[PDB]
Amino acid sequence: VVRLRLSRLGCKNRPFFRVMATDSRSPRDGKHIEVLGYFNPLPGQDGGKRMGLKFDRIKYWLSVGAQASDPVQRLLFRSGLLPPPPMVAMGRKGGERDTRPVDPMTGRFV
Amino acid sequence: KPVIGTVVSNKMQKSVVVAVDRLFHNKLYNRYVKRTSKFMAHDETNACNIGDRVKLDPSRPLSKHKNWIVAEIIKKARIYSPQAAAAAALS
């Protein structure tokens, strides 16, 4: 089965991901059919995360029956190319979060 | 592309061997070197003489070394027959 999955790039303790179209039997960072985009799991200066996708190629691979992995299902819902995964209906776990403000430039308590 | 060569052997049954020339570019010394391949081709009627210029088509494997089929004889080789030549002299 063709799979839309995540290949690990970056370095140790600095993860970066590429979105790949692969045969399922292939090694994780080895052989692939196509690079489809990227995803940055670390939050940047803008307060959010980054992602790029080749929308037409992802539509091609989904049209011929490729199966997205568990993080790629979330990433493709978030970009609007797939419906929401079934577990996002459960809502978030609550609890008292520490909302004491920290300075953006210095990281100390305001 | 189109594969054209000269018949160098025809003594097999339904088979010829065809010599095809090509130019190899020696990149270090900037010259063009003639190289020859000998290809075995199917010739059902056994019509090709040695020295004929033929065109070959690709084919599925027909035998162990036969992968081509003779399609067209472009130029026929000249064969010296002494008695036909003597009859031409008598005319």
Binding site: - | N26, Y29, N30, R31, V33
Partner: protein, 124 residues
């Protein structure tokens, strides 16, 4: 040559003999001393240079020089052998390394003393 000649018959390389064939492209080789002796230099030099006949671990027999002043080598002492000839002595193409295995360092040496296995003198 012409370009056609170079196509037919290219260019070969220069032929140069190996300097230390017995080291077998290793940086060092362990050995055991067979005979410890002296040898006189080629003229115009004159001395008594302390050498050692060493059988290497790859069963090669070499002559190695013992550098510095004074040594403790005997027959059947383990020596680590590095490359580098001694120009006074033909046929001696190697050196013994001071301060490793049986060949001791030279205490009292003060300058250039890591080439002679000598430690740094502790200040008191």
């Amino acid at each position: 040559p012409t370009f056609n000649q170079l196509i037919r018959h290219g260019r070969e390389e220069k032929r140069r003999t190996d300097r230390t064939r017995a080291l077998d492209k290793c940086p060092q080789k362990l050995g055991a001393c067979l005979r410890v002796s002296t040898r006189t230099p080629k003229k115009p030099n004159s001395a008594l240079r302390k050498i050692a006949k060493v059988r290497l671990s790859n069963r090669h027999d070499i002559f190695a020089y013992i550098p510095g002043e004074g040594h403790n080598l005997q027959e059947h002492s383990q020596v680590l052998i590095r490359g580098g000839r001694v120009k006074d002595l033909p046929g001696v193409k190697f050196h013994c390394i001071r301060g490793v295995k049986d060949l001791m360092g030279i205490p009292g040496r003060r300058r250039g003393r890591s080439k002679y296995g000598a430690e740094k003198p502790k200040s008191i």
